[PDB]
Amino acid sequence: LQMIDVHQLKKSFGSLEVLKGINVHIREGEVVVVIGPSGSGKSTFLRCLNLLEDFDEGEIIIDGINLKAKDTNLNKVREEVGMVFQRFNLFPHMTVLNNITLAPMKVRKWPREKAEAKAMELLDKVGLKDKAHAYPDSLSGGQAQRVAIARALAMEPKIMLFDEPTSALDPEMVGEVLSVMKQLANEGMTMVVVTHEMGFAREVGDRVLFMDGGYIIEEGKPEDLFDRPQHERTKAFLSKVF
Amino acid sequence: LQMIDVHQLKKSFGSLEVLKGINVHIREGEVVVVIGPSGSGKSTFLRCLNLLEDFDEGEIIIDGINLKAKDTNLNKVREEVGMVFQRFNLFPHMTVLNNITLAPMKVRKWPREKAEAKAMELLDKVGLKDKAHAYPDSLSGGQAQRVAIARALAMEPKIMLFDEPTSALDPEMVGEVLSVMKQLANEGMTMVVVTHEMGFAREVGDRVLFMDGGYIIEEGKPEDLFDRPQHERTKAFLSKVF
Amino acid sequence: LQMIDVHQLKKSFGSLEVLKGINVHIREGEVVVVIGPSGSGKSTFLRCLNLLEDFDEGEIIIDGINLKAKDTNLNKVREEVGMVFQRFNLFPHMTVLNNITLAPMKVRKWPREKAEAKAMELLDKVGLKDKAHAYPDSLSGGQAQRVAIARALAMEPKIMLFDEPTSALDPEMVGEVLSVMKQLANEGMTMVVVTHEMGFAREVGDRVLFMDGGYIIEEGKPEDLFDRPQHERTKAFLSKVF
Amino acid sequence: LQMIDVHQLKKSFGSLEVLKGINVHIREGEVVVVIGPSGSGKSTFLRCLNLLEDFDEGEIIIDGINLKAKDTNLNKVREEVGMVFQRFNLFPHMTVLNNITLAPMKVRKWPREKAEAKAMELLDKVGLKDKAHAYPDSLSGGQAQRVAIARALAMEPKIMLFDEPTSALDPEMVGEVLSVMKQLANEGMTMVVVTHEMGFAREVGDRVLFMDGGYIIEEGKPEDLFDRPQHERTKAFLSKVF
Numbered sequence: 009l010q011m012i013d014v015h016q017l018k019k020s021f022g023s024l025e026v027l028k029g030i031n032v033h034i035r036e037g038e039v040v041v042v043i044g045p046s047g048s049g050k051s052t053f054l055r056c057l058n059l060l061e062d063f064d065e066g067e068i069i070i071d072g073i074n075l076k077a078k079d080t081n082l083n084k085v086r087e088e089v090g091m092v093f094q095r096f097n098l099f100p101h102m103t104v105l106n107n108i109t110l111a112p113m114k115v116r117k118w119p120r121e122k123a124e125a126k127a128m129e130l131l132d133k134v135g136l137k138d139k140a141h142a143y144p145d146s147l148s149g150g151q152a153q154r155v156a157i158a159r160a161l162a163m164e165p166k167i168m169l170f171d172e173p174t175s176a177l178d179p180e181m182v183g184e185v186l187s188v189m190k191q192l193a194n195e196g197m198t199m200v201v202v203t204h205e206m207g208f209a210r211e212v213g214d215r216v217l218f219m220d221g222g223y224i225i226e227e228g229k230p231e232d233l234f235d236r237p238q239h240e241r242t243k244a245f246l247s248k249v250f
Numbered sequence: 251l252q253m254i255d256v257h258q259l260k261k262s263f264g265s266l267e268v269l270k271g272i273n274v275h276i277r278e279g280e281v282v283v284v285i286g287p288s289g290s291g292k293s294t295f296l297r298c299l300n301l302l303e304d305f306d307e308g309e310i311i312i313d314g315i316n317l318k319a320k321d322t323n324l325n326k327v328r329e330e331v332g333m334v335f336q337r338f339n340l341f342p343h344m345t346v347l348n349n350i351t352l353a354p355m356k357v358r359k360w361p362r363e364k365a366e367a368k369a370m371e372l373l374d375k376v377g378l379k380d381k382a383h384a385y386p387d388s389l390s391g392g393q394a395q396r397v398a399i400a401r402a403l404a405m406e407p408k409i410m411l412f413d414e415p416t417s418a419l420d421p422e423m424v425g426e427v428l429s430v431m432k433q434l435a436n437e438g439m440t441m442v443v444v445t446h447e448m449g450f451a452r453e454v455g456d457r458v459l460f461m462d463g464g465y466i467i468e469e470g471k472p473e474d475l476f477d478r479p480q481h482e483r484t485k486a487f488l489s490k491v492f
Numbered sequence: 493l494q495m496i497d498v499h500q501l502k503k504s505f506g507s508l509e510v511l512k513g514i515n516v517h518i519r520e521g522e523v524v525v526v527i528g529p530s531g532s533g534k535s536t537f538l539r540c541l542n543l544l545e546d547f548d549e550g551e552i553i554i555d556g557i558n559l560k561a562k563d564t565n566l567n568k569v570r571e572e573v574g575m576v577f578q579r580f581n582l583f584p585h586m587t588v589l590n591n592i593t594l595a596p597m598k599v600r601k602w603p604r605e606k607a608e609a610k611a612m613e614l615l616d617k618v619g620l621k622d623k624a625h626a627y628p629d630s631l632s633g634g635q636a637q638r639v640a641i642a643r644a645l646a647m648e649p650k651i652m653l654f655d656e657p658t659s660a661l662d663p664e665m666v667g668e669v670l671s672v673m674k675q676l677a678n679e680g681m682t683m684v685v686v687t688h689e690m691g692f693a694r695e696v697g698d699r700v701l702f703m704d705g706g707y708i709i710e711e712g713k714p715e716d717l718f719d720r721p722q723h724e725r726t727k728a729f730l731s732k733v734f
Numbered sequence: 735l736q737m738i739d740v741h742q743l744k745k746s747f748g749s750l751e752v753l754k755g756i757n758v759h760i761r762e763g764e765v766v767v768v769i770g771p772s773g774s775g776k777s778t779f780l781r782c783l784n785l786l787e788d789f790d791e792g793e794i795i796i797d798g799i800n801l802k803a804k805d806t807n808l809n810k811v812r813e814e815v816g817m818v819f820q821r822f823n824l825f826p827h828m829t830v831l832n833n834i835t836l837a838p839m840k841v842r843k844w845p846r847e848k849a850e851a852k853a854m855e856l857l858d859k860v861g862l863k864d865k866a867h868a869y870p871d872s873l874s875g876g877q878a879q880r881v882a883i884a885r886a887l888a889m890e891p892k893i894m895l896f897d898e899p900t901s902a903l904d905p906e907m908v909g910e911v912l913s914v915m916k917q918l919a920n921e922g923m924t925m926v927v928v929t930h931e932m933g934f935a936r937e938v939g940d941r942v943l944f945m946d947g948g949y950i951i952e953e954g955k956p957e958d959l960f961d962r963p964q965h966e967r968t969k970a971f972l973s974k975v976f
């Protein structure tokens with residue numbers, strides 16, 4: 009039924025409880041956009057979904073695989089979840105092409121040639137096939153972020169997580185990244201995107217999750233939550249940032 | 251998380267097992283369209299959601315109310331779920347106005363004045379204000395189905411069930427009913443619609459459920475399931491519709 | 493002057509030269525019927541006149557506007573040319589009415605009321621006023637093709653292109669479509685029609701263009717070209733529709 | 735009559751309508767400054783003039799060339815319009831000289847000697863003739879922006895666009911760049927400058943365009959618009975600036 013099933017997820021960092029009982033259902037092929045004030049645990053939530061973070065209480069089931077089960081291979085689960093961070097996504101001492109074939113070649117044992125062809129295909133999809141042999145330090149922010157997306161997709165994941173991938177870029181470079189993300193959404197990839205770009209949220213998001221202080225205060229279709237919020241805290245957040 | 255939660259639902263008629271274990275998650279505000287071969291249990295399924303049919307196995311929770319809770323709770327489920335049939339939704343020997351107010355007054359103990367006011371606003375919603383005092387025998391099939399909707403809505407339900415609502419209608423009379431259902435969808439009503447109007451599904455439906463022989467064989471976004479069906483039984487059914 | 497002026501038009505799809513020097517003059521109000529063997533470039537020619545294809549060599553002037561001039565707005569020219577394809581002409585997720593008012597409201601900025609009123613006039617003209625609120629999937633081939641025509645005319649174009657609009661229809665629904673086309677011809681609309689229905693060409697065509705292998709082998713009034721063709725290739729082709 | 739002619743321009747990202755109908759007339763030789771609240775669409779507007787962004791409605795004509803004209807023709811627009819961004823204008827891994835000659839040689843097919851002669855002439859223009867063989871990492875931010883201008887100018891554009899050209903600079907380095915831009919203005923260049931440097935605007939601008947939420951709320955001579963604004967939105971923004 010769901011590609012991502014989260015039940016009463018709780019997470020603390022010592023004395024500080026960040027996630028206070030998150031409940032989420034995301035269907036395969038759905039694009040879920042997460043918004044909310046800072047410190048609400050948006051990034052922490054993504055990190056949990058990417059297995060970069062252990063969790064205290066709750067249950068997380070990815071593609072029918074409970075992360076707490078005996079027979080669960082967490083590295084295998086980590087193979088089906090791709091993630092793009094706000095900033096440093098590439099190894100600097102590696103070329104674009106090699107950054108992309110590294111995991112597929114190691115993890116999925118693809119021969120160097122099967123990996124590189126797939127990488128050239130993803131580079132073309134993001135419009136940077138000509139940068140295959142360049143190093144990250146020579147890319148613009150917008151180009152590096154697109155390559156970061158190609159790299160994550162090279163593992164052919166079932167889910168793609170995005171933690172404010174454009175929040176850092178200058179306005180000129182924002183579109184080229186969102187454009188790739190939109191293209192990716194039209195392809196049926198299950199996506200979870202933390203972002204402040206409400207235009208992208210409305211246009212390509214299937215559902216929006218309003219996270220505030222460790223809780224999902226409201227949930228709903230973009231149109232319904234942005235223009236018909238049902239909770240004052242939601243209207244509050246939406247008004248102040250407008 | 252879900253207005254309608256269905257788990258491993260099974261329904262048999264002694265020997266005949268109509269529902270072979272279906273699972274469904276419908277969120278508040280979603281419009282779900284159900285399509286599939288005859289004898290697949292689509293209608294029986296709806297009648298289980300409305301407590302019109304009892305089930306042998308599985309679990310059903312509507313708006314947080316389990317369908318196996320005390321009757322007193324089941325009554326609120328009954329009141330909160332509205333349903334429109336192929337035909338026969340109105341009492342033929344009763345005016346349009348009286349058909350609409352009957353249940354609110356009798357069940358919700360609403361007073362005459364409040365019930366009629368609501369009924370009149372609803373007649374405006376479906377475009378049949380001037381038909382308030384007419385009898386069903388004086389309405390076209392298209393106007394009768396619209397009155398059926400206003401009647402189901404008079405109870406202020408949180409969910410609206412439609413079982414092939416326009417199927418008994420001439421093609422010329424289908425649009426006006428679909429138009430009203432679309433308006434209801436835009437207002438955020440949780441809807442479960444069993445229909446053959448595929449165009450309507452593409453425009454108004456959030457998800458489509460393909461049922462075949464008592465099983466939910468495929469589920470997905472209308473465009474995805476319609477244009478790029480993944481399972482063979484789905485493809486087979488669509489090759490007869492498209 | 494000349495509603496359509498094409499000089500030495502050449503078109504290639506890679507190393508495949510499809511049109512190799514097309515020359516055509518079509519004055520306003522003329523109904524030009526294009527015939528010829530398969531793969532002659534008939535559809536390609538129409539695609540070019542509708543700006544769906546960029547051409548390699550030659551000139552194309554639509555109502556005095558050269559498509560290669562620096563001050564030419566190619567989009568404004570596309571607004572002037574309506575097209576009806578052999579098959580998929582309507583958005584499946586929209587009603588008949590909404591299919592027709594989409595471009596007029598979006599492109600010509602007509603308020604909903606002015607667009608819908610004009611859409612109803614056209615629906616009536618094509619005899620489908622009672623289908624305004626129906627969806628494409630509920631239409632027969634014949635009805636859908638007539639709505640496709642109604643839709644194209646909604647933009648009030650100066651030219652109407654038809655790529656074998658009845659070739660796909662059963663012989664039962666061919667009539668209603670040609671009928672609308674005949675009525676459109678009687679109204680003075682400049683038309684270009686690719687068709688195999690030679691009965692329509694003789695009756696409504698002001699001129700017939702015999703295309704073969706990317707060249708216009710012969711041109712002339714229907715009677716003259718069908719009854720007394722001058723080129724043996726023209727006679728060869730006509731004797732075979734026999 | 736206008737080097738830049740913009741009519742009812744609209745640009746949207748889903749429901750987000752960034753530009754809501756902009757009309758702009760800029761004559762050859764005028765210097766137009768654009769000011770306004772963040773999110774008004776100032777940068778998006780400039781990106782439309784340089785064919786970096788595509789638009790939904792209305793039309794743009796640059797130097798008699800329409801932006802919806804054939805490509806081979808749009809390339810001439812791209813060549814005639816230069817632009818300086820707030821930060822990333824140069825390739826950090828190549829020298830000042832090579833940065834300036836790159837496009838001229840690659841795009842305009844200018845030979846090396848001609849390209850370098852022009853680059854040297856332009857370096858004298860911006861006052862960095864001794865920086866020809868330096869790398870961007872050895873230039874102050876102010877020197878780098880002056881090189882960005884020389885670089886944009888090497889293509890001999892008819893129009894120069896500036897998107898907050900000095901905004902990322904220390905107040906101490908803002909003057910040297912404004913000085914170059916002032917010189918460029920005295921030379922008769924058509925310029926569009928999105929900037930917060932009001933003093934510069936009063937001296938160098940022929941007109942000012944105040945943008946607010948996708949609209950050009952007010953326009954006029956710098957002194958008139960700044961010192962005696964007519965509209966409330968204009969007054970409101972200015973109370974935050976002066």
Ligand SMILES: Nc1ncnc2c1ncn2[C@@H]1O[C@H](COP(=O)(O)OP(=O)(O)S)[C@@H](O)[C@H]1O
Pocket residue numbers: 021026045046047048049050051052053
């Ligand atoms: N590793 C670690 N160790 C200790 N504390 C952490 C850690 N990571 C986050 N935090 C804190 O958790 C809160 C949510 O961070 P989050 O970034 O998830 O909030 P948003 O993404 O909503 S801004 C915020 O105070 C972060 O400072």
Ligand SMILES: Nc1ncnc2c1ncn2[C@@H]1O[C@H](COP(=O)(O)OP(=O)(O)S)[C@@H](O)[C@H]1O
Pocket residue numbers: 263266268286287288289290291292293294295
């Ligand atoms: N009361 C009763 N008693 C015995 N059998 C019944 C009964 N009611 C239904 N059936 C049968 O259930 C199947 C699904 O009906 P359903 O109408 O749910 O299929 P669809 O809605 O998909 S056409 C089909 O064979 C119906 O003949």
Ligand SMILES: Nc1ncnc2c1ncn2[C@@H]1O[C@H](COP(=O)(O)OP(=O)(O)S)[C@@H](O)[C@H]1O
Pocket residue numbers: 505508510528529530531532533534535536537
């Ligand atoms: N997009 C594209 N890409 C590659 N090739 C194409 C394309 N479109 C057409 N062709 C070919 O051009 C020829 C004429 O097609 P045309 O349909 O114009 O011939 P008729 O209309 O006379 S049957 C025939 O081989 C078509 O296969």
Ligand SMILES: Nc1ncnc2c1ncn2[C@@H]1O[C@H](COP(=O)(O)OP(=O)(O)S)[C@@H](O)[C@H]1O
Pocket residue numbers: 179182183184186205207208747750752770771772773774775776777778779
């Ligand atoms: N690619 C993309 N996708 C979605 N939304 C976008 C995109 N690009 C811009 N926008 C938005 O356009 C608005 C104006 O940006 P503009 O930078 O033109 O405002 P100013 O220059 O006035 S600060 C603002 O909300 C920007 O967030």
